[PDB]
Structures are given as C-alpha cells and as structure tokens.
Write a protein that binds this ligand. Structure first.
Ligand SMILES: Nc1ncnc2c1ncn2[C@@H]1O[C@H](CSCC[C@H](N)C(=O)O)[C@@H](O)[C@H]1O
Lengths: 189, 240
C-alpha cells in the first residue's frame, strides 16, 4: 500500500525523461509510473530473486522498451550515474536512511526530484538530510488511519539544487471509522 | 482606539485591543493551547506578546511565572492593562525589550518559550498593504527575523527546555532546519487546514533544547466543515 501511494505522489511532468527506483522489488512502482509517463525507468534491486519477477512483470506487460532492471546496490550504482535522472523514487525497507538520500543526490540532474515515503517519526531527520545534500523539500503529504489518528506515514518530495519553500498537501485519511477505505483513498488504486 | 472584549469563551478573561495595532487571531489561540503545560514548566516566556493574549490563556492552565517580551511600547501599555484588568499581576509580567537582547541578558532562564512570530519576510514596502506601521511591524520581519527568534529561543532555554512556535507552512523545513542549527530537536507537529480538501496553511511545532530525535505528528486540525462552520474540534479551543 505504501508503494501505490508513493507512485501516485510522484510529480510526473514532461521534463521527466529518465527515472529511477531505489530498491524496486517486483517493479510495481515502475509499472504504475508506466501508466503516466513516457520517460525511461530504471529499477535497482540487490537480490536476483526480485530481478526475475520484475523482469517477468515488464515482459508480461510489454514495456521492455521503457523499463529496465539493474542488479546493484543503490550506493555503488549511484556513484556511477552523476546528473542522470529527473526523478528518483524510493520506498525504503545494509542501507541507512542517510545512504538513500546521499545516493539520490549523487545521481540526480540539477533541479531533479527525489520522492520518498517513510515513517512520520522520521520527518525532521529526513528534512535535515535533504538539506545536508542540497535537496530542497517541496511537497509533503501526511497519512493518517482515521481522522482522529496520529499520522503513521509521510510522503516527501524534494528538488536537488532547488530553491526554498514547501507545499503541504491535504492530509490523507485512509479509512473511515467503519474500517472502510475512504472515498479519497480510492482515487489511488 | 482601545475596545474591551471577551477572550472568546475563556471564563474570567477579557482584554483590550487597539484598532491600529495587531489584534489576536486563531493562530494566537492555537499556539497557546498547543503548549505543553506540565508541572515542570515553572517559568514561561512569550516572544512578542502584544496585548498579552497568549499569557492570558496559558494562565488558565498553570501557575507558572509568565514573562511577556514586547518591543512596541504602545503594546506594552495595553498588555499591562490586560494583566491588571484580569488581576494576574502576581503571575504575569511584561518587559519592554528586544527579543534578541533580552535573550542575551536572561540566558538559560526558562523552561518554555512560545512565540507567534511575524510571518512574512521583508520584500519591498511592507506598509503598502497595512494600515499602520504597528501592524506592519507585527506581520512582517522588520523588527525581528525568524532565525533571530529561534536563536534567541535557544539562548533563553535551559537543558530540556521547550520552544513552541506557529508559522506559515511554506517555511516548515526552514524552521526544522533552524531548530537543528541551534540544538533544538523537533518533537511535536500539527498541521492546520481550513477545509478537509485545502492545503495546510499553518503549522504548530514544538521541540526540546538539547533533547533527542523523534517526532510525534498529531492529527491534522481542520478548522471549518464544508458548510463553512467551525468544526467541533476547533470550538474546543474557543474555551477552557
Ligand atoms: N524584536 C522584537 N522584540 C520583541 N517583540 C517583537 C519584536 N519584533 C516584533 N515583535 C512583536 O511580536 C509581535 C508579533 S504578532 C504576535 C502577537 C501575539 N503574541 C498573538 O499571539 O496574537 C508584535 O506585537 C511585535 O511587536
């Protein structure tokens, strides 16, 4: 469910010509993104098991000329790809949160976009690491279970070598108090 | 010109407010109620207190000594009238001072600093859109800057002291980042939206001087139902 939220949150304008997914598993995010962009997508997965399915899913869906898997560690991969991507998106799980954000800055084009989903307790630390690697936080969205609940999940978008100022989108409430998904959540999926 | 009015539905609370100065807002009320007022907070400080609406509300919940710092002398006079009028002279004191220089002179004195800062930076003629220099000096960063407020809050606070702020949501990371720069660890956060479909316009943020990491993101506050009426959650803050 995280992966559907982070996918639809990605700001997919026409400047996106090359996108990357950190720790792509079955390539669910690339496949979802596929339905909104013509940019070439690259998914990076450290485990061969997941590589077969993701490749299988790109085969089954006939996007082999748009999406591609790469069997690598995000850290080593990113040192090899300076100023490459318009978007890096990562749905985190030997790789720390600082590693993900550093790696993202090592391989984004200037004014490119880094999109992450994570636990709400970690918002201030992610914001400090964004700034430590010259990523300027831009869009935030909170995820709450019910209207009376503390947020569990945050969605965070930032621009590498961008300017200052945030946009905080209307909080998302996943389900009503009957434990039925809210109409708002249904727009996703 | 001063007018006397009740401080929303807070019982035994009235306050004068001048039409050519800043009049309190929902922001003032919510940042007062968002403060943590546990028994350890023994001394409190309001940065830029104006007519002292924030102390007047905090006092309904704690017996701590409350100091209000304010720079515009016409407001200190109104503030001191409101404290006497409500008989709070024993608890609340007003000091005509600059936040910066006050903080340099009263270092490590407080367990809690709260602040409803001027929201807008300086960019052109600030008075062009205001009715009076005294309003412009409350809404724009002409006599104080955001970094000054946070730096000053760190000079005034004591270990495990608590800085509480309300501000525009566009500047949340800037604020987060200035917190870390002065060793204030963000802890509690709540977004305020007008409507369930609107972008958050305001944030409430709290953090601990020389504390630890870890954030609690409280449920978003919607202030209006789609029918344009105050929500029931908001009306809970209109009284004690
Ligand atoms: N440098 C400074 N030192 C002390 N107060 C200052 C200041 N610069 C601005 N202020 C004051 O800060 C206030 C900001 S408006 C906040 C009003 C009030 N605390 C409320 O919640 O409604 C103004 O009254 C302004 O005079």
């Amino acid at each position: 469910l995280d992966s559907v939220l982070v996918a639809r949150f990605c700001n997919l304008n026409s400047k996106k010509k090359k996108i990357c997914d950190f720790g792509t598993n079955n390539a669910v995010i690339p496949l979802i993104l596929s339905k909104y962009t013509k940019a070439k997508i690259i998914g990076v997965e450290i485990q061969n098991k997941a590589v077969e399915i993701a490749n299988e899913n790109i085969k089954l869906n006939g996007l082999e000329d748009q999406i591609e898997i790469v069997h690598a560690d995000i850290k080593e991969f990113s040192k090899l790809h300076n100023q490459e991507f318009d978007l890096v998106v990562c749905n985190p799980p030997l790789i720390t949160l600082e590693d993900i954000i550093k790696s993202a800055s090592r391989c984004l084009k200037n004014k490119g976009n880094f999109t992450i989903v994570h636990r709400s307790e970690r918002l201030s630390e992610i914001i400090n690491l964004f700034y430590k690697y010259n990523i300027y936080p831009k869009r935030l969205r909170l995820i709450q279970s019910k209207k009376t609940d503390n947020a569990k999940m945050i969605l965070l978008d930032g621009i590498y070598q961008g300017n200052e100022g945030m946009e905080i989108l209307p909080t998302l409430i996943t389900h009503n108090d009957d434990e039925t998904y809210t109409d708002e959540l249904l727009k996703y999926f």
